[PDB]
């Protein structure tokens, strides 16, 4: 169980040991983004600042998720292309 | 560089967003709203602001877990390939 | 259980059904090589004629084995080089 | 383009073998001798000539079986490859 502090509040979450540091980065990002929005005075309400912060990080995570899905699809295709040639080489 | 409007947990948000990002922001907002919805439903956390933070944490956890699960599938596939290699090699000459 | 005729002599041998044709082909080769040697007057004795035939067939068979051992080695090295590329493609 | 002399089952044979073939013939004669001896050891076939004919047949069967066995190893390796692909494609 990991506990991170985001904008004057404490959150206790459950996560694999292999994710601790990474989730702490997400917390640090949230915290900073929130402080930025809060001090911008353009978003009224604590809940509003949190959703804007959360929407921002969800927007970056989706892009990293898209890049991940591309590289994963490229590897899968090269592997499929290579295994297919092993098959042919064995057929003759 | 125009205004985009999205609904998130029964509230509206007008955001200045780049054109080639619109679809991405809407997806994010959609995904966010969805995650925030099922988190408020659990009653495990109280406070709209906290619901948003936890939602961001879980979505983060989902990507990480997606990647680890990918690395592990890639790792096992590799062991099977070394097994296939070591087999076509036990028949050496 | 195949039966072939090789120069006025009958031979009953045990072999996989998927080999009958090839073994018969072997018997035909021996049979004709034996008739050629016998009608050459160069080799005296039924056994010496049979050995010379057998040596001639063992000689072609070892050459066929050399090529078979080559092709198989080439395939083996190509499959080995291909599966190694799959390993690399998955490592990153 | 000369004469090679090999020992095959206690008789001698002087063949008119080509130069770049000598090593091959000696090997074959060496291999032939080996099978004829085994066939003689197992009192089953009567006749030096029959022993040579059976020896040539066994050696034939040997290469055939060596081949079928190699085609079966490749066949099975291919199945394992399709399995590995299917699993990869199963994602």
Asked if C58 lies within 8 A of D61 by C-beta distance, the reply is: no
A48 and A90 fall within a common domain:
yes
For helices C46-91 and D22-41, angle between their N-to-C axes, nearest 10 degrees: 110
Give the CATH number, domain containing residue A39: 3.30.160.880
- DSSP H helices in C1-92: 20-38, 46-91
B58 and B82 fall within a common domain:
yes
Of B78, B88, B93, the CB nearest to C79: B88
- DSSP, residue by residue, D18-86: -GGGHHHHHHHHHHHHHHHHHHHHS----SHHHHHHHHHHHHHHHHHHHHHHHHHHHHHHHHHHHHHHH
CB A90 within 8 A of CB D74: yes
What tokens were used for C67?
Answer: 């090529």
Burial class (CB in 10 A: 0-12, 13-18, 19+), B36: buried
Rounded CA separation D56/D76 (Å) = 31
Backbone angles phi, psi at D12, to 5 degrees: -110, 150
Set of chain C residues whose Cβ sits within 8 Å of the Cβ of D68: 16, 18-19
Residue with tokens 């297919």: A84
**CA A25 to chain CA centroid, nearest Å:** 10
What tokens were used for D83?
Answer: 């399995």
Of C72, C76, C87, the CB nearest to B82: C87
Set of chain C residues whose Cβ sits within 8 Å of the Cβ of B74: 90
- What is residue D4's three-state secondary structure? strand
Nearest residue to D88 via CA among A89, B65, B81: B81
Of C82, C89, C90, the CB nearest to A86: C82
Cα torsion through C22, C27, C28, C32, rounded to 10? 150
C68 and C33 fall within a common domain:
no
A32 and A50 fall within a common domain:
no
CB B42 within 8 A of CB A77: no
Domain count of the fold of chain D: 2
Distances (CA, A) of B2 to A52, B5, B56: 17, 10, 25
A51 and A65 fall within a common domain:
yes
Rounded CA separation A55/A49 (Å) = 10
Distances (CA, A) of D43 to A16, A85, C57, D37: 73, 51, 24, 11
D61 and D26 fall within a common domain:
no
**What are residue D14's DSSP bridge partners?**
D5
Asked if D85 lies within 8 A of A90 by C-beta distance, the reply is: no
Nearest residue to B29 via CA among B47, B50, B52: B52
In Å, how far is D69's CA from the nearest CA of chain B? 11
C65 and C34 fall within a common domain:
no
Set of chain B residues whose Cβ sits within 8 Å of the Cβ of A9: 49-50, 53
Rounded CA separation B56/B53 (Å) = 5
Return the half-sphere exposure (C-beta side, CA atoms, 13 A cut-off) of residue B79. Answer: 5
Give the CATH number, domain containing residue B86: 1.20.5.50
Other C-beta atoms closer than 10 Å to the C-beta of A90 total: 20
What tokens were used for C17?
Answer: 């059904």
| Residues near B35 by beta carbon (within 8 Å), at least 6 away in sequence | B55, B58, B59
Distances (CA, A) of B69 to A24, A67, B58, C34: 20, 16, 16, 69
Q: Report the run of H or E that residue B5 belongs to, with start and end.
A: strand B2-8
Rounded CA separation B62/A41 (Å) = 31
Nearest residue to A13 via CA among B66, B48, B53, B37: B53
| Residues near D9 by beta carbon (within 8 Å), at least 6 away in sequence | C51, D33, D36, D37, D40, D48, D51, D52
What tokens were used for A65?
Answer: 């998720």
Distances (CA, A) of C30 to A87, C55, C65, D56: 38, 10, 18, 8
Rounded CA separation C45/C38 (Å) = 9
Could you report how far apart the first and last alpha carbons of chain B are, in Å? 67
Asked if C23 lies within 8 A of D63 by C-beta distance, the reply is: no
- Using an 8 Å CB-CB cutoff, list residues of chain C that contact chain D: 6, 9, 11, 13, 15-16, 18-19, 22-23, 26-27, 30, 46-55, 57-59, 61-65, 68, 72, 75, 79
Of D28, D67, D68, the CB nearest to C59: D28
A85 and A50 fall within a common domain:
yes
| Residues near B88 by beta carbon (within 8 Å), at least 6 away in sequence | C76, C79, C80, C83, D77
Phi-psi region of B52 (alpha: psi -120 to 50; beta: other; left: phi over 0): alpha
**What are residue C2's DSSP bridge partners?**
C13
Distances (CA, A) of D29 to A54, C36, C68: 84, 20, 20
Set of chain B residues whose Cβ sits within 8 Å of the Cβ of C90: 74, 77-78, 81
B52 and B84 fall within a common domain:
yes
Set of chain D residues whose Cβ sits within 8 Å of the Cβ of B77: 84, 87-88
- Using an 8 Å CB-CB cutoff, list residues of chain B that contact chain D: 73, 77, 80-81, 84, 87-88, 91
A21 and A57 fall within a common domain:
no
A26 and A48 fall within a common domain:
no
For helices A20-38 and A46-91, angle between their N-to-C axes, nearest 10 degrees: 140
**What are residue D7's DSSP bridge partners?**
D12
Rounded CA separation D60/C13 (Å) = 12
Rounded CA separation A83/D60 (Å) = 35
Q: What is the resolution of this structure in A?
A: 2.5
Distances (CA, A) of D80 to B20, B30, D42, D56, D67: 45, 43, 42, 37, 20
B10: which DSSP letter? Answer: T
Q: Which of B26, B45, B64 is the last residue of a domain?
A: B45
Residue with tokens 């095959």: D8
- Substitution target from C68, C85, C88 for chain A, most A beta carbons within 10 A: C85
**What are residue D5's DSSP bridge partners?**
D14
- Chain A: residue whose CA lies nearest to B65: A19
C33 and C50 fall within a common domain:
no
Backbone angles phi, psi at D90, to 5 degrees: -85, 40
Phi-psi region of D14 (alpha: psi -120 to 50; beta: other; left: phi over 0): beta
In Å, how far is D65's CA from the nearest CA of chain A? 18
Residue A52: give the domain boundaries.
44-92
Of A80, A90, A91, the CB nearest to D85: A80
Set of chain C residues whose Cβ sits within 8 Å of the Cβ of A82: 82-83, 85-86, 89
Long-range contacts of B75-78 (CB under 8 A, 24+ apart): B77/A79, B77/C90, B77/D84, B77/D87, B77/D88, B78/C87, B78/C90, B78/C91
Q: Which of A43, A58, A73 is the last residue of a domain?
A: A43
Rounded CA separation D63/D69 (Å) = 10
Q: Report the run of H or E that residue D12 belongs to, with start and end.
A: strand D11-15
């Amino acid at each position: 169980t990991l506990t991170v502090q985001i904008l004057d509040k404490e959150y206790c979450i459950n996560c694999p040991d292999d994710e601790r540091a990474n989730l702490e980065s997400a917390a640090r990002y949230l915290d900073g983004k929130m402080r930025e929005i809060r001090s911008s005075g353009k978003v009224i309400g604590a809940d509003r600042v949190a959703v804007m912060a959360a929407l921002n990080i969800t927007h970056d995570l989706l892009h990293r998720k898209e890049r991940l899905d591309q590289e994963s699809s490229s590897t899968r295709e090269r592997v499929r292309e290579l295994l297919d040639r092993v098959d042919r080489a064995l057929a003759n």
